[PDB]
Amino acid sequence: MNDQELRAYLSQAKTIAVLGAHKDPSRPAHYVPRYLREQGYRVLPVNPRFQGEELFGEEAVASLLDLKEPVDILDVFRPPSALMDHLPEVLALRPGLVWLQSGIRHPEFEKALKEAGIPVVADRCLMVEHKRLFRG
């Protein structure tokens, strides 16, 4: 996505589901979502590892299909070796955009999303990118 379009996309978005949301403050899967909530987004934590625990002001759910509202951005922190097993729930939720966090790439997974008509941004830190597009 070019910057102009990616900016229009991020500024209009409201709900960001964080796949692999973490409770430990030092983890990117915790502090990136933290930053996002500050920027006015509704962050929905998803991680079976913390199911039921309140993260980012919301109760974490085990599966994407447990979310009770449309997802504008799916911020993915799960490693490449775990992505294919999530594909079914990802395609089912059909988020407006899939964002693979830093150090996460997966050809087949990415190709499957493209084929389903779902935009993908890969190997980028959403916080960093948000800062660069809306502050300089």
Count of residues in the chain: 136
For residue 2, give the CATH number of its domain. Answer: 3.40.50.720
How many domains, in total, are found in the chain? Answer: 1
For residue 76, give the 3-state DSSP assignment.
strand
Structure tokens, 122: 């890969």
- Give the domain extent around 71: 1-136
Instruction: Quote the longest CA-to-CA distance of the chain.
Output: 38
What is the SS3 assignment for 82-109? Answer: HHCCCHHHHHHHCCCCEEECCCCCCHHH
Q: What was the structure determination method?
A: X-ray
Residues contacting residue 82 through CB under 8 Å, at least 6 positions apart: none
Nearest residue to 33 (alpha-carbon basis) of 75, 79, 71, 65:
75
In whole angstroms, give the CA distance from residue 85 to residue 40.
31
**Radius of gyration over every alpha carbon of the chain, rounded to an integer in angstroms:** 14
Which strand ranges, in their side-by-side order, compose the sheet holding 98-100?
Answer: 42-46, 15-19, 73-76, 98-100, 120-122
